[PDB]
Design a protein around this ligand. Structure first.
Ligand SMILES: Cc1cn([C@H]2C[C@H](O)[C@@H](COP(=O)(O)OP(=O)(O)NP(=O)(O)O)O2)c(=O)[nH]c1=O
Ligand SMILES: [Mg+2]
Ligand SMILES: [Mg+2]
Length: 342
DNA sequence: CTAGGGTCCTAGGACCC
DNA sequence: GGGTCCTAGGACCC
């Protein structure tokens, strides 16, 4: 009853696209990210930049201190999206069981594929090659009997590599695996687990399910399952986007509502333009706003509303501004929309 | 010195029976 | 007394 799941993952996806499109960035540390003055962070970076410690989600200010010759690129999301469409169409040549997770990665369920004599190892390789031959970018891949093990495996031979985990290899692979490597166990959860003596899946295997359920809820059940290789989630392939949001972080904290409203006026056309791509009639389920203050607390207020409407967003923003801001500076304003169900 | 695009889970009160 | 919706917040992913 064992299935074959491939996880494909582009190498330094945005950076790799920028070097293809301008070879001059090939051997210099580059990074896609807002400038220091724009208070931005690194989206991604190439390997000459991560040699210096540059990571995704790092404040640009901290990147430039580690890597003073970093080259900041603004990013060209149409170029990234075109490559994403291309790779996904490459996936289609092999199976329709494709669940994309972002521009640059997808799960594939190749169980009932008889490409490459049903070898998932050689299907994964034949996709990386091909991506290489047709897009001049590289991908890493992971092959395992379940989703999360396949995702972990795609980082172990990154860049331009892959890694296979057979069911017979699963128990030994699990035994020393830090919990934080499990997709969905982040920093906060890992630090709680660590603080009661749980670091690896082998640790959680010595744990009672009931206790984990009491301490963590459904997350505790997830944690006990994954700790044993149990991950029965199917590769979906028909997930649909449920929301679209637009938010902006100013270079300077705003302190006056005239500043906020002017920002909303620039945000709204963008949100409308993007909603129309997926809902021409702008018919929606809910709309709302987001403010992030200078103490980094953030708040949203949204409500049932039937159609993208600028004035109600301005209205509810003004309300949020007055009712919850306490004279703090505001670093970010965002608009939001929850899409209708079908 | 802390982005912007998202997803999913939780939790109290409203509302319903 | 038990479901289901509404909203806010937050952990987490890319
Ligand atoms: C994690 C992350 C990613 N991104 C963008 C930029 C990345 O190029 C793209 C793919 O995300 P990955 O996690 O796959 O990292 P990567 O750049 O492709 N490097 P890697 O996959 O080789 O580790 O998605 C961001 O903008 N912010 C992020 O935090
Ligand atoms: Mg990647
Ligand atoms: Mg990825």
């Amino acid at each position: 009853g064992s299935r074959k799941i491939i996880h494909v993952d582009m190498d330094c996806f945005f950076a790799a696209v920028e070097m293809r499109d301008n070879p001059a960035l090939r051997d210099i540390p580059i990074a896609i990210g807002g400038s220091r003055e724009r208070r931005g962070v690194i989206s991604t970076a190439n390997y000459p930049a991560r040699k210096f410690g540059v990571r995704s989600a790092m404040p640009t200010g901290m990147a430039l201190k580690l890597c003073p010759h970093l080259t900041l690129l603004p990013g060209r999301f149409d170029a990234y999206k075109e490559a994403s469409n291309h790779i996904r169409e490459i996936f289609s040549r092999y199976t329709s069981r494709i669940e994309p997770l972002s521009l640059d990665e997808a799960y594939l369920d190749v169980t009932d594929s008889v490409h490459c004599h049903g070898s998932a190892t050689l299907i994964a390789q034949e996709i990386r090659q091909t991506i290489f031959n047709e897009l001049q970018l590289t991908a890493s891949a992971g092959v395992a009997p379940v989703k999360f093990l396949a995702k972990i495996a795609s980082d172990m031979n990154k860049p331009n590599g892959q890694f296979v985990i057979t069911p017979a290899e699963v128990p030994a692979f699990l035994q020393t695996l830090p919990l934080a490597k499990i997709p969905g166990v982040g920093k906060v959860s890992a630090a709680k687990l660590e603080a009661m003596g749980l670091r690896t899946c082998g640790d959680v295997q010595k744990c009672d399910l009931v206790m984990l359920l009491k301490r963590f809820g459904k997350f505790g059940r997830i944690l006990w399952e994954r700790s044993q290789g149990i991950d029965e989630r199917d590769v979906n392939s028909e997930r649909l986007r449920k929301s679209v949001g637009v938010e902006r972080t100013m270079a300077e904290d705003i302190h006056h509502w005239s500043e906020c409203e002017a920002i909303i006026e620039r945000l709204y056309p963008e949100l409308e333009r993007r909603l129309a791509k997926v809902k021409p009639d702008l018919l929606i389920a809910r709309q709302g706003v987001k403010l992030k203050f200078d103490d980094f607390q953030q708040t949203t207020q949204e409500h049932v509303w039937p159609r993208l409407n600028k004035a109600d967003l301005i209205a509810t923003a003004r309300k949020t501004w007055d009712e919850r801001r306490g004279g703090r500076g505001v670093r970010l304003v965002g608009l939001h929309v929850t899409l209708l169900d079908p």
